[PDB]
């Protein structure tokens, strides 16, 4: 049995999030909570929450002790983007993208 957790429409761009997800994909619960707390990247204070709340469904809905858990699925998907503009030189404009992502973590007891 596996418990999942999602954070829909976070405002960090998706291929900035993906740099962190790699470092934790396959590690252990207590090791994963520590890596996301000693890294200097900006997507750490958000990804950590999505992981600290997958472990609250792994024990309150089902019944698993939170010591022997591994991280099985960790990916970031795309979300709807925002259109913006920034005026350039000599009466011309250029577009901007405010990108968004969905983050997802699944923790399991290897059974």
């Amino acid at each position: 049995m596996e418990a999942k957790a999602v954070a829909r429409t976070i405002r960090i761009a998706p291929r900035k999030v993906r740099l962190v997800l790699d470092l934790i994909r396959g590690k252990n619960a207590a090791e994963a909570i520590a890596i996301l707390k000693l890294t200097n990247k900006a997507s750490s204070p958000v990804i950590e929450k999505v992981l600290m709340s997958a472990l609250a469904n792994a024990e309150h809905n089902y019944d698993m002790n939170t010591d022997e858990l591994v991280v099985k699925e960790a990916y970031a998907n795309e979300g709807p983007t925002l259109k913006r503009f920034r005026p350039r030189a000599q009466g011309r404009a250029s577009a901007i993208n405010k990108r968004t992502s969905h983050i997802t973590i699944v923790v399991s007891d290897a059974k």
Partner: protein, 50 residues
């Protein structure tokens, strides 16, 4: 100068072979019992204990 040809999904994914961040390289503290950065203080409670 401008690009003459488009770039394929293959040539784009080889360039990023090396675009990855490394492990922070941490150790457990012999008080807190919690992972801390090497040669720094334990944030959870500060005890360097040189």
């Amino acid at each position: 100068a401008v690009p003459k040809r488009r770039t394929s999904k293959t040539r784009k994914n080889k360039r990023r072979t090396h675009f990855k961040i490394s492990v922070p390289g941490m150790t457990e503290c012999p008080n807190c019992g919690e992972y801390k950065l090497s040669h720094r203080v334990c944030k959870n409670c500060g005890s360097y204990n040189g």
